[PDB]
Design a binder for this molecule. Structure first.
Ligand SMILES: CC[C@@H]1C[C@@]2(C)C=C(C)[C@@H](C)C[C@]23NC(=O)C(=C3O)C(=O)[C@@]2(C)[C@@H]3CCC[C@H](O)[C@H]3C=C[C@H]2C[C@H]1O
Ligand SMILES: CC[C@@H]1C[C@@]2(C)C=C(C)[C@@H](C)C[C@]23NC(=O)C(=C3O)C(=O)[C@@]2(C)[C@@H]3CCC[C@H](O)[C@H]3C=C[C@H]2C[C@H]1O
Lengths: 142, 145
């Protein structure tokens, strides 16, 4: 029963933010629709030694669930240097913002294929609007 | 051996129950102190039938409306299927919202049962909105690996 367990990953996250809002022209303007704030992000993954273990790409949008709690929905994947890809996606409470956040993950290729689990992220520093610093962990089981 | 295994479910009749929220400006709490917008979202729970009429599973997920840099209105979905044979398939991704009647497709991953280790595409096409709470959808799931 194999367990992949990447801990204390250092994630440089390059963030392209759009606040969205009420659509003002196009097909969306004629509909009861609001454009959520979104972030397109492009990450580099490093182990403790400072070696690049992979990359990441995904997108996250803000919304609120049935009770009014502010949430975010993410869809993303990691391409790791040794071969495989791991997808991760789900919703998580937005606040507090320095809290560790987790969503289910699924290994799809390489040595991760057929394994599922959880990808975790936690904001450490936000030097500027285009860069976020995160410590991550990945736990996969099968 | 070096043999590809595939799953191909076509012409699924998917009855989808939608709980829709408008979104907009957050007017209370920590979120109201920031220039963020809550997207219009839908939380759905589906029943899946094959063409013969026998149920083959359920689905549950969330989708939120946003836009990309050029202003193309998009949705991002995160869902999973649970099938009657026991296995589980997650699917998630972004897709252009318009036209709303064209088939939309996002990546899918089999995670358990006969689907484990296979990845591909989950496709959904809206056929009717018989009431504000119900979608009738034609869907398909393709996985290989
Ligand atoms: C809820 C945790 C989140 C941290 C994390 C680390 C959590 C994730 C799951 C990863 C995808 C990476 C993320 N990194 C991020 O920069 C990020 C993230 O989604 C964001 O959304 C930011 C930039 C928003 C963009 C939308 C508009 C806001 O002005 C902005 C206000 C702070 C953060 C939110 C931050 O508090
Ligand atoms: C992209 C088109 C979409 C087709 C599909 C079939 C595509 C999907 C990937 C599935 C999740 C199933 C969905 N079915 C759905 O009812 C659904 C879906 O996202 C929706 O978003 C609805 C309810 C929105 C809710 C958010 C606010 C909008 O005012 C509303 C206006 C009609 C539909 C849009 C529908 O036309």
């Amino acid at each position: 029963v194999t367990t992949i367990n990447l801990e204390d990953i250092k994630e440089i996250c390059h963030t392209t933010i759009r606040l969205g809002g009420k659509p003002e022209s196009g097909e969306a303007a004629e509909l009861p629709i609001f454009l959520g704030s979104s972030v397109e992000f492009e990450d580099e993954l490093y182990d403790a030694d400072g070696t690049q273990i992979g990359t990441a790409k995904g997108t996250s949008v803000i919304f609120a669930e049935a009770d009014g709690t502010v949430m975010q929905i993410v869809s993303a994947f990691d391409d790791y240097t040794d071969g495989g890809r791991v997808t991760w996606s789900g919703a998580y409470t937005m606040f507090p913002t320095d809290e560790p956040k987790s969503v289910p993950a699924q290994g799809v290729s390489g040595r991760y294929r057929g394994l599922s689990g959880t990808r975790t992220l936690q904001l450490l520093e936000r030097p500027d609007p285009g860069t976020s610093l995160i410590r991550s962990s990945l736990v996969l089981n099968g």
